[PDB]
Write a protein that binds this ligand. Structure first.
Ligand SMILES: *[C@@H]1O[C@H](CO)[C@@H](O[C@@H]2O[C@H](CO)[C@@H](O)[C@H](O)[C@H]2NC(C)=O)[C@H](O)[C@H]1NC(C)=O
Ligand SMILES: *[C@@H]1O[C@H](CO)[C@@H](O)[C@H](O)[C@H]1NC(C)=O
Ligand SMILES: *[C@@H]1O[C@H](CO)[C@@H](O)[C@H](O)[C@H]1NC(C)=O
Lengths: 88, 50
């Protein structure tokens, strides 16, 4: 239940909270999904201020996917597990 | 560079290539017969290479 309900003009979702929000345990399978709500009449632009994978080019054990709406592959702009994540 | 930042640097006209140099810090790769026209009207732009 790693829920992260938030909105506003901006907001910085980090990998620091996933050990600090205490919904996880060190060394177990997570399904923690961040939820982004816009301000009314707005569009969303994810940019990466930091990006670092412990197993590069291995999209089985660590990745970051970007779903544009609900959990559907109909709206899946990009899915990164390489060294560099471009901005969507 | 330009493949990684395609939404940033690549523009949709020669007109937007002028404005990004007039406003931002930009090095627009224009064809050399409309560099020889814009630099005649705007004396604040130049052809910096060959
Ligand atoms: C002096 O040179 C600068 C270029 O460095 C001219 O352009 C300014 O550049 C900033 C960003 O680099 C932008 O806000 C505008 O394109 C320009 N600003 C202003 C206030 O003009 C600048 O015009 C030149 N002249 C003066 C008097 O500063
Ligand atoms: C966004 O702008 C409105 C006014 O246009 C302002 O009242 C509001 O505080 C701004 N948002 C934030 C998070 O400050
Ligand atoms: C180029 O920019 C500067 C700032 O105003 C000035 O020398 C000149 O007026 C500009 N060029 C034109 C054509 O306005």
């Amino acid at each position: 239940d790693c829920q992260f309900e938030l909105s506003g003009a901006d907001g910085i979702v980090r990998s620091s909270q996933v050990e600090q929000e205490e919904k996880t345990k060190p060394g177990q399978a997570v399904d923690c999904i961040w939820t982004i709500k816009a301000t009314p009449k707005a569009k969303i632009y994810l940019r990466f201020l930091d990006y670092q994978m412990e197993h590069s080019n291995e999209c089985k054990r660590n990745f970051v996917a970007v779903y544009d709406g609900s959990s559907a592959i109909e709206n899946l702009k990009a899915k990164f597990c390489s060294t560099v994540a471009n901005d969507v | 560079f330009m493949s990684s930042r395609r939404q940033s640097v690549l523009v949709k006209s020669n007109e937007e290539g002028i404005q990004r140099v007039l406003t931002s810090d930009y090095a627009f790769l224009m064809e050399s017969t409309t560099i020889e026209f814009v630099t005649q009207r705007n004396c604040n732009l130049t052809q910096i290479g060959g």
